[PDB]
């Protein structure tokens, strides 16, 4: 089981064919028929090793680490001849052969070993890939979980030298663009969490992690899809090139990965392969001893007594297979050895064409410094040469990171893969053909964004998580993380940034006071109207002649003003109104004192009536000073969180100070009118004035101490002030008209 065609030079090469059940049919013998294709297409091509036939010596690796070492001794046991192997297509296969070809100085060219450990050039100093490392693959998994703003993800990586050193470079590149990984764990096949149902349940315990980064190998992604359909669930499988663009890892679970996003490595494929690999039947196939049963296992044929025996019209056309992505890399990484062993011949022995004596030892260290910086044109089957087709190794012997972004679009019945994107500067994937799980762009964040009514961003200690919590309704949410207050008087709008002020109320609308006391004040116009018969119609009455005929024009005209000052208590507050209420209340109780205590010396006496007529302005001039000097415009009281009630610019004691200027003259009114409690003059002094000395001004000391207790203060001061003069309007001044007529 090893090909041996002779040649003046020998190229090695060890390929994963077995897996020893299957022949692997996609990344296996579809690559061994490509490297052997290029060797068949070198010896015919002149000006590239002319006259020096290249022969190969190929062995399988059985897709296993410690079996590759037993097959790697077939090269070097003649050295204790080979001028370079073509590496191993897997990762753990090609690490622990570079730890044995290093000792004999044999160069190794891998073509798929995307691992980060193989750039430490102090240990593997004979290892140049033609595939970019996995640091440029975590960089395409941070810029693809930020173009969709997924933040709360859950990474899964297989154990070994591929996952654990390709996910330790993702956790140090997802904690740099604020991506919060929930659950990271191993899945590998040596007793960590080897039950695949024990790890698909852990990804189901989190309900808010629908984006799972599958950085696993090609073995633990056909046993994590065959264990994510039994224990039935679904996510958005974002996966590395372990999954890749393989249509044989998904052969029996075509509905659970129906929105998967995988990224292969970008390759414009070769177009002379499908005229060669398609024309290889088991009848005409000599060299490789694994191709004689490849068509047996692929087409399920036979050659013991199994199913349908091979008919000769069974070939491999484009209805069977699609050419693998990493077939450009196989024919590229074998010409790089063919450009090294040609430029060496142009240096050591340029006069001769065949193998000289100076190139018969094959100095390995000199072969690694004539080759590591060797750029070239291309694999010559791919056109657009200058448009990114230059094979070129870096200082570490790598390629350039060029990553297509595939998608598992299940649209045409046949569940096929489909390209959407790019890399190397550009995240250029177009969201118009990407199908998804449940046909929607999914979200995975730690906490949901909530309503902007009272919530706020409260991130306790980290960046990826927060919590929305209600705050006060009088505040505004300005900085979107802590709401702030605007103060009393103003109320925030629906935007929760600015606050709008409020007026007081419609005091004059009804309030059970815009119709009640003004109807009592509607009869207040009838107090002076009913007393107008004493005024002008019957001014020559003998009882009025013995009364204060000049005094009743002060005693009853202001009684109508006491029935008129309540009108200003219902209008809008203003310096023309609420300061006039300070001028009105002093004028209203300028009659209850000047017609009770003064009329004891006038109506129950004109030699001193000039001082009594000047007694109304005895404090009213000083009351004019307190109605002019302090602030007499407006105010606005603010109670608990909803009050804009606009009282005038005084206090309760300021009205009490004006109340003290007149009621003290009414306090000693009945004390100065207690002597005439039995003896009248015209049956009116002891019969009427003593009643208004007691009963009238007691109401002036009843509701007035209650004026500083109430809150709305609607009719406690408007009605009762106008109602208190109706006693002294009728029982002493309208009472005289009762026996008149």
Ligand X SMILES: COc1cccc(C(=O)N[C@H]2C[C@@](N)(C(=O)O)[C@@H]3[C@@H](C(=O)O)[C@@H]32)c1
Q: Which residues bind its own copies (CB under 8 A)?
A: 65-66, 69-70, 73, 77, 80, 96, 99-100, 102-103, 120, 123, 164, 168, 186, 190
Nearest approach, Cβ of 63 to ligand X (angstroms)?
A: 5
Interacting residues of 346 by C-beta distance below 8 A, sequence separation 6+: none
The one of ligand NAG, ligand X, its own copies, none whose footprint includes residue 102, by CB under 5 to 8 A per kind, is: its own copies
114 annotated to bind ligand:
yes
Nearest CA among 653, 690, 658, 661 for reference residue 673: 690
Please, which residues bridge with residue 196 across strands?
none
186 annotated to bind ligand:
no
Site string for ligand NAG, 140-159 (x = CB under 6 A): --------xx----------
Q: How far apart are CA 572 and CA 579, in angstroms?
A: 11
112 annotated to bind ligand:
yes
Nearest approach, Cβ of 72 to ligand NAG (angstroms)?
A: 49
Q: How far is CA 435 from CA 253, 264, 439, in A?
A: 17, 18, 6
The one of its own copies, ligand X, ligand NAG, none whose footprint includes residue 670, by CB under 5 to 8 A per kind, is: none
Nearest approach, Cβ of 143 to its own copies (angstroms)?
A: 22
The torsion angles phi and psi of 527, rounded to 5 degrees, stand at -70, -50
Nearest approach, Cβ of 242 to ligand X (angstroms)?
A: 4
Interacting residues of 676 by C-beta distance below 8 A, sequence separation 6+: 600, 604, 685, 686, 689, 690
340 contacts 125 by C-beta, under 8 angstroms? no
- Which parts of 14-43 interact with ligand NAG (CB under 6 A)? none
Helix (H), strand (E) at residue 199:
helix 197-200
162 annotated to bind ligand:
yes
The one of ligand NAG, ligand X, its own copies, none whose footprint includes residue 662, by CB under 5 to 8 A per kind, is: none
Interacting residues of 389 by C-beta distance below 8 A, sequence separation 6+: 268, 377, 378, 379, 382
Nearest CA among 1, 19, 2 for reference residue 10: 2
Nearest approach, Cβ of 86 to its own copies (angstroms)?
A: 22
Nearest approach, Cβ of 306 to ligand NAG (angstroms)?
A: 53
DSSP code per residue over 418-443: EE----TT-----TTS---GGGS---
375 contacts 130 by C-beta, under 8 angstroms? no
Q: Which residues contact ligand X by CB under 6 A?
A: 27, 63, 89-92, 112-114, 160, 162, 217-219, 241-242, 326
The one of ligand X, ligand NAG, its own copies, none whose footprint includes residue 715, by CB under 5 to 8 A per kind, is: none
DSSP code per residue over 526-594: HHHHHTHIIIIISTT-HHHHSS-TTTHHHHTHHHHHHTTTTSTTTS--STTTHHHHHHHHHHHTTSTTT
Q: How far apart are CA 418 and CA 433, in angstroms?
A: 9
Please say which residue, 144 or 179, places its beta carbon nearer to ligand X: 144
Please say which residue, 248 or 710, places its beta carbon nearer to ligand X: 248
The one of ligand NAG, its own copies, ligand X, none whose footprint includes residue 17, by CB under 5 to 8 A per kind, is: none
Closest-by-Cβ residue to ligand NAG is 149
**How many residues interact with ligand NAG (rule CB under 6 A)?**
2
Nearest approach, Cβ of 422 to ligand NAG (angstroms)?
A: 17
The one of ligand X, its own copies, ligand NAG, none whose footprint includes residue 217, by CB under 5 to 8 A per kind, is: ligand X
325 annotated to bind ligand:
no
The answer to the question of residue 428 lying near ligand NAG (CB under 6 A) is no
Please say which residue, 294 or 476, places its beta carbon nearer to ligand X: 294
Nearest approach, Cβ of 407 to ligand NAG (angstroms)?
A: 17
The torsion angles phi and psi of 422, rounded to 5 degrees, stand at -160, 180
358 contacts 348 by C-beta, under 8 angstroms? yes
Instruction: Name the site residues for ligand NAG (rule: CB under 6 A).
Output: 148-149
**Residues annotated in a binding site for L-glutamate:** 91, 112-114, 162, 241, 326
**Residues annotated in a binding site:** 91, 112-114, 162, 241, 326
């Amino acid at each position: 089981r090893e090909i041996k065609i002779e040649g003046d030079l020998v190229l090695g090469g060890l390929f994963p064919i077995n897996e020893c059940g299957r022949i692997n049919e996609d990344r296996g013998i579809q690559r061994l028929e490509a490297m052997l294709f290029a060797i068949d297409e070198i010896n015919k091509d002149d000006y590239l090793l002319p006259g020096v036939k290249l022969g190969v010596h190929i062995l399988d690796t059985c897709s296993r680490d410690t079996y590759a070492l037993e097959q790697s001794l077939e090269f070097v046991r003649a050295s204790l001849l080979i001028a370079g192997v073509i590496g191993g297509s897997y990762s753990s296969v090609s690490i622990q052969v570079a730890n044995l070809l290093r000792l004999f100085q044999i160069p190794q060219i891998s073509y798929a070993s995307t691992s980060a450990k193989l750039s430490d050039k102090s240990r593997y100093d004979y290892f140049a890939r033609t595939v970019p490392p996995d640091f440029y693959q975590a960089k395409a998994m941070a810029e693809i979980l930020r173009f969709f703003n997924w933040t709360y993800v859950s990474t899964v990586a297989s154990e070994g030298d591929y996952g654990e050193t390709g996910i330790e470079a993702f956790e140090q590149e997802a904690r740099l663009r604020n991506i919060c990984i929930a659950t990271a764990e191993k899945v590998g096949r040596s007793n960590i969490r080897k039950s695949y149902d024990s790890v698909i349940r852990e990804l189901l315990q989190k309900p808010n992690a629908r984006v799972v980064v599958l950085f696993m190998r090609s073995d633990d992604s056909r046993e994590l899809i065959a264990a994510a359909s039994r224990a039935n669930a679904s996510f958005t499988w974002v996966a590395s090139d372990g999954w890749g663009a393989q249509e044989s890892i998904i052969k029996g679970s075509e509905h659970v990965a129906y929105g998967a996003i995988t990224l292969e490595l970008a390759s414009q494929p070769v177009r002379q392969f499908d005229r060669y690999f398609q024309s290889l039947n088991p009848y005409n196939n000599h060299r490789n001893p694994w191709f004689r049963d490849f068509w047996e296992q692929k087409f399920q044929c036979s050659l013991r007594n199994h199913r349908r025996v091979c008919d000769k019209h069974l070939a491999i056309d484009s209805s069977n297979y699609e050419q693998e992505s990493k077939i450009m890399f196989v024919v590229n990484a074998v010409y790089a050895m063919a450009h090294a062993l040609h430029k060496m011949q142009r240096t050591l022995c340029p006069n001769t064409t065949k193998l000289c004596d100076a190139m018969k030892i094959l100095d390995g260290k000199k072969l690694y410094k004539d080759y590591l910086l060797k750029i070239n044109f291309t694999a010559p089957f791919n056109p657009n040469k200058d448009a990114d087709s230059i094979v070129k190794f870096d200082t570490f012997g790598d390629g350039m990171g060029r990553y297509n972004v595939f998608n598992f679009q299940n649209v045409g019945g046949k569940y096929s893969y489909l390209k959407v994107g790019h890399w190397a500067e550009t995240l250029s994937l177009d969201v118009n053909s990407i199908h998804w799980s449940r046909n929607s762009v999914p979200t995975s964040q730690c906490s949901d964004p909530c309503a902007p009514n009272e919530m706020k961003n409260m991130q306790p200690g980290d960046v990826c998580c927060w919590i929305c919590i209600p705050c006060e309704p009088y505040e505004y949410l300005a900085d979107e993380f802590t709401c702030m207050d605007c103060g009393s008087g103003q109320w925030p709008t629906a935007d929760l940034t600015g606050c709008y002020d409020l007026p007081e109320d419609y005091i004059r609308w009804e309030d059970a006071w815009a119709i009640g006391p003004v109807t009592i004040a509607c009869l207040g116009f009838m107090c002076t109207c009913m007393v107008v018969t004493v005024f002008i119609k019957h001014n020559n009455t003998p009882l009025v002649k013995a009364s204060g005929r000049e005094l009743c024009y002060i005693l009853l005209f202001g009684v109508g003003l006491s029935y008129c000052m309540t009108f200003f208590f219902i209008a809008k507050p203003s310096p023309v109104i609420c300061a006039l209420r300070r001028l009105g209340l002093g004028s209203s109780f300028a009659i209850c004192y000047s017609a009770l205590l003064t009329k004891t010396n006038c109506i129950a006496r004109q030699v001193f009536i000039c001082l009594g007529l000047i007694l109304v302005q005895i404090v009213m001039v000083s009351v004019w000073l307190i109605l002019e000097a302090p602030g007499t415009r407006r105010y606005t009281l603010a109670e608990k969180r909803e009050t804009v009630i606009l009282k005038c610019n005084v206090k309760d004691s300021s009205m009490l100070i004006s109340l003290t200027y007149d009621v003290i003259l009414v306090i000693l009114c009945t004390v100065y009118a207690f002597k005439t409690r039995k003896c009248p003059e015209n049956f009116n002094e002891a019969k009427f004035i003593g009643f208004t000395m007691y009963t009238t001004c007691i109401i002036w000391l009843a509701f007035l101490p209650i004026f500083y207790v109430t809150s709305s203060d609607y009719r406690v001061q408007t009605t009762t002030m106008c109602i208190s003069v109706s006693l002294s309007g009728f029982v002493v001044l309208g009472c005289l008209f009762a026996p008149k007529v």
